[PDB]
Amino acid sequence: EFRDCAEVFKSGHTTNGIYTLTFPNSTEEIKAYCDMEAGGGGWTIIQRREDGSVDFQRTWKEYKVGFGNPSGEYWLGNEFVSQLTNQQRYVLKIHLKDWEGNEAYSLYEHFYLSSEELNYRIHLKGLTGTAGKISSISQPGNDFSTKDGDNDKCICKCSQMLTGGWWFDACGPSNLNGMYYPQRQNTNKFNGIKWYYWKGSGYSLKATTMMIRPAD
Amino acid sequence: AMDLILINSLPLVSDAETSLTCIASGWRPHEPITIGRDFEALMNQHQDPLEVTQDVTREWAKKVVWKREKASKINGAYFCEGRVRGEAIRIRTMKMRQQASFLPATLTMTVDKGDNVNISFKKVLIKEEDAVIYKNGSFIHSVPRHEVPDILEVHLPHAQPQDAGVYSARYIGGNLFTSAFTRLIVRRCEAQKWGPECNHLCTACMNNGVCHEDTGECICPPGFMGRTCEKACELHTFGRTCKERCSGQEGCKSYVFCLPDPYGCSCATGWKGLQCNEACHPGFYGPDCKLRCSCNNGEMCDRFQGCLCSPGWQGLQCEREGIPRMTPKIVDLPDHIEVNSGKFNPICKASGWPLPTNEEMTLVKPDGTVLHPKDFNHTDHFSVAIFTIHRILPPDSGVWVCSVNTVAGMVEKPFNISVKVLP
Numbered sequence: 001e002f003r004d005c006a007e008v009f010k011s012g013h014t015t016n017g018i019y020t021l022t023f024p025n026s027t028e029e030i031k032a033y034c035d036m037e038a039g040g041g042g043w044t045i046i047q048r049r050e051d052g053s054v055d056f057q058r059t060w061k062e063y064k065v066g067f068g069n070p071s072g073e074y075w076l077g078n079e080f081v082s083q084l085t086n087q088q089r090y091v092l093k094i095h096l097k098d099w100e101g102n103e104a105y106s107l108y109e110h111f112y113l114s115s116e117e118l119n120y121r122i123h124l125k126g127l128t129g130t131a132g133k134i135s136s137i138s139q140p141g142n143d144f145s146t147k148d149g150d151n152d153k154c155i156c157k158c159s160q161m162l163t164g165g166w167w168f169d170a171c172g173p174s175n176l177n178g179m180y181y182p183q184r185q186n187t188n189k190f191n192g193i194k195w196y197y198w199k200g201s202g203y204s205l206k207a208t209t210m211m212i213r214p215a216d
Numbered sequence: 217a218m219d220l221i222l223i224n225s226l227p228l229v230s231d232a233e234t235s236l237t238c239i240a241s242g243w244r245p246h247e248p249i250t251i252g253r254d255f256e257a258l259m260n261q262h263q264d265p266l267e268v269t270q271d272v273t274r275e276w277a278k279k280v281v282w283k284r285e286k287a288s289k290i291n292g293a294y295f296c297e298g299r300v301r302g303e304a305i306r307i308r309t310m311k312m313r314q315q316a317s318f319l320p321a322t323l324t325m326t327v328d329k330g331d332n333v334n335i336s337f338k339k340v341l342i343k344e345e346d347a348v349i350y351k352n353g354s355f356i357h358s359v360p361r362h363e364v365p366d367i368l369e370v371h372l373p374h375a376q377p378q379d380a381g382v383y384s385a386r387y388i389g390g391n392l393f394t395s396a397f398t399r400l401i402v403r404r405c406e407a408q409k410w411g412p413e414c415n416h417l418c419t420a421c422m423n424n425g426v427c428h429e430d431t432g433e434c435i436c437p438p439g440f441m442g443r444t445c446e447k448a449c450e451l452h453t454f455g456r457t458c459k460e461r462c463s464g465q466e467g468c469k470s471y472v473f474c475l476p477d478p479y480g481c482s483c484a485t486g487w488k489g490l491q492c493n494e495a496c497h498p499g500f501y502g503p504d505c506k507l508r509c510s511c512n513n514g515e516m517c518d519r520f521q522g523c524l525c526s527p528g529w530q531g532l533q534c535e536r537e538g539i540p541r542m543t544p545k546i547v548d549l550p551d552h553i554e555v556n557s558g559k560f561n562p563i564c565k566a567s568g569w570p571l572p573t574n575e576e577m578t579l580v581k582p583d584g585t586v587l588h589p590k591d592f593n594h595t596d597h598f599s600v601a602i603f604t605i606h607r608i609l610p611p612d613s614g615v616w617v618c619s620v621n622t623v624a625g626m627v628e629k630p631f632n633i634s635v636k637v638l639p
């Protein structure tokens with residue numbers, strides 16, 4: 001039935017909530033969370049980071065099919081996000097909330113990944129937003145790395161270094177998948193949820209919502 | 217009461233041998249001299265036993281030499297104690313790969329409570345990686361690969377004392393020992409103020425000398441003495457009063473001196489450098505030649521002493537005429553004594569035109585107690601300070617030292633007392 005959240009929205013389903021979608025050109029279904037009551041309305045949360053919840057340091061394959069319930073935080077699964085993107089043309093909006101008591105987003109004009117035999121290389125273009133003037137996600141998208149997914153450029157392994165899977169450069173200005181640190185421990189931490197250009201290298205965000213749409 | 221002087225044979229370790237030397241000049245320290253890794257400062261340091269053999273070029277000092285090619289686990293933070301009557305005294309430093317990737321542009325940095333400071337790092341062997349700063353062995357922050365400064369700074373406006381330590385710098389991927397070190401030293405009070413609550417003024421010091429915010433005196437730079445450090449020692453000397461000759465032929469062209477923490481580690485007056493291999497451009501002169509000769513009537517600026525005014529005039533800059541000041545001399549003092557257990561009144565009589573005062577005159581017991589005069593005399597020439605000691609008994613025998621320190625220099629002369637017992 002429903003491929004992505006836009007199709008849910010246009011189907012008048014305008015209500016923030018969990019929905020079941022189906023892979024394009026296939027008969028496989030992957031559940032997720034749609035953010036209708038939001039911006040334009042109709043976003044497909046590919047990830048959230050609201051509290052401790054379930055970790056992220058997981059098998060490369062786990063970051064492949066996804067993990068975590070969509071009720072709270074989760075990752076959905078690169079493969080779905082990989083195909084679901086080359087179908088049409090999607091953007092990407094990254095929104096995060098800090099402890100002190102602020103919040104900002106970042107909007108990419110176009111986003112998509114690649115073949116598993118290409119390590120799901122990310123590609124982001126046309127950057128806008130309030131959380132930076134420079135793409136916090138390492139330009140020239142690198143391969144997605146994991147505990148056992150050394151496909152980065154550090155002469156070392158950023159994943160085992162920064163905890164969790166992410167498009168690490170030689171350990172870039174970002175990693176939204178890194179040890180959820182509490183209120184009074186949200187500073188001078190390396191393996192923490194950081195988006196650099198909006199806070200600091202030592203900051204560990206309190207919230208982290210990554211979501212996508214096409215151009216409805 | 218305790219003149220310790222740690223020596224760092226070039227903090228930048230290479231294929232060549234390096235060493236540490238903790239010299240105690242003046243006092244025959246009782247509590248044994250220590251040397252070793254200052255584990256607290258640079259944390260996560262590897263715990264290796266470093267042999268501390270004795271040195272025989274100077275009267276009382278232990279050394280630590282890391283033999284060529286063997287110099288592998290030498291990076292980090294070392295120090296060395298002294299200990300006088302129950303109290304302490306330590307001097308800290310660092311040892312780092314000469315190679316590495318960055319370079320401190322200075323080993324130490326002294327500031328007063330509330331100075332905006334810039335802990336820098338010269339980028340040298342640029343790699344396709346990220347930058348990371350590490351205080352004490354703890355992570356602070358990093359710099360993203362594509363925008364890594366040229367002179368990697370670290371800004372801390374209004375530095376407090378608990379904000380000092382050892383800031384490091386390494387390209388993300390690399391040993392916690394391939395890092396580059398540098399110490400920042402903040403003192404409890406602000407410039408020129410010392411005190412149990414910083415409500416007293418420091419004995420203003422010249423020739424780049426720092427002031428101990430615990431006592432009020434200055435820790436002169438290796439090359440000058442005097443209550444204000446205005447006195448230019450013998451060319452190529454060092455030591456609380458100068459009685460220590462820099463060894464190596466070219467003056468001190470390779471010694472990085474370190475004094476008690478309120479000061480730090482600077483080259484000896486006359487050399488610029490990180491290894492102090494460089495003499496000084498004309499016009500400047502102090503330690504690390506941070507001193508600019510503002511010699512008035514255009515006099516010779518000596519890269520060690522300063523201005524060499526014409527006869528008839530003296531002054532840091534020759535800005536004053538007057539009878540030339542002559543340092544003190546502890547005159548007329550026996551080498552032995554032989555006294556009987558009882559009321560005892562030692563006396564130090566000392567010369568010098570800037571003439572000492574009981575403020576400036578002491579007598580130091582062997583164990584290290586400082587003793588002040590009970591009554592002061594005075595005369596045409598020479599100051600007579602009489603000390604009084606309750607009941608001096610046999611165990612006090614040893615080597616006492618009359619010590620005078622005015623604004624024209626410091627001087628110590630020992631004598632051997634031998635309290636016997638009356639039948």
Ligand SMILES: *[C@@H]1O[C@H](CO)[C@@H](O[C@@H]2O[C@H](CO)[C@@H](O[C@@H]3O[C@H](CO)[C@@H](O[C@H]4O[C@H](CO)[C@@H](O)[C@H](O)[C@H]4NC(C)=O)[C@H](O)[C@H]3NC(C)=O)[C@H](O)[C@H]2NC(C)=O)[C@H](O)[C@H]1NC(C)=O
Nearest residue numbers: 188255256257258259351352353354355378379380381382
């Ligand atoms: C380099 O910089 C790091 C910080 O970046 C310093 O390390 C931290 O230092 C702080 C300040 O002292 C220290 O905080 C102390 O934490 C302990 C326990 O968490 C508390 O307990 C102390 O008293 C109890 C008795 O009730 C003892 O049982 C503990 O052993 C004792 N703490 C210790 C181990 O010394 C202290 O009360 C608390 N201080 C206060 C009052 O705030 C952190 O524990 C240190 N953490 C780290 C990362 O090591 C480091 O000291 C510094 N190095 C230097 C000296 O420059």
Ligand SMILES: *[C@@H]1O[C@H](CO)[C@@H](O[C@@H]2O[C@H](CO)[C@@H](O)[C@H](O)[C@H]2NC(C)=O)[C@H](O)[C@H]1NC(C)=O
Nearest residue numbers: 561563565591592593594595596599600601602
């Ligand atoms: C300082 O006090 C000392 C000790 O109380 C005095 O020194 C003695 O002076 C007499 C002369 O009055 C000499 O004969 C002795 O030889 C001195 N004692 C010693 C050290 O041997 C002296 O009165 C005082 N000095 C001055 C000049 O005021």
Ligand SMILES: *[C@@H]1O[C@H](CO)[C@@H](O[C@@H]2O[C@H](CO)[C@@H](O)[C@H](O)[C@H]2NC(C)=O)[C@H](O)[C@H]1NC(C)=O
Nearest residue numbers: 244551552553554613614615616631632633634
């Ligand atoms: C302090 O001086 C006395 C002077 O008598 C020293 O005593 C002895 O001096 C003779 C002189 O030739 C030596 O042969 C001995 O070695 C000394 N005997 C002792 C007690 O060791 C005494 O040694 C001196 N002490 C110091 C620290 O110099």
Ligand SMILES: [Ca+2]
Nearest residue numbers: 150152156157
């Ligand atoms: Ca790698």
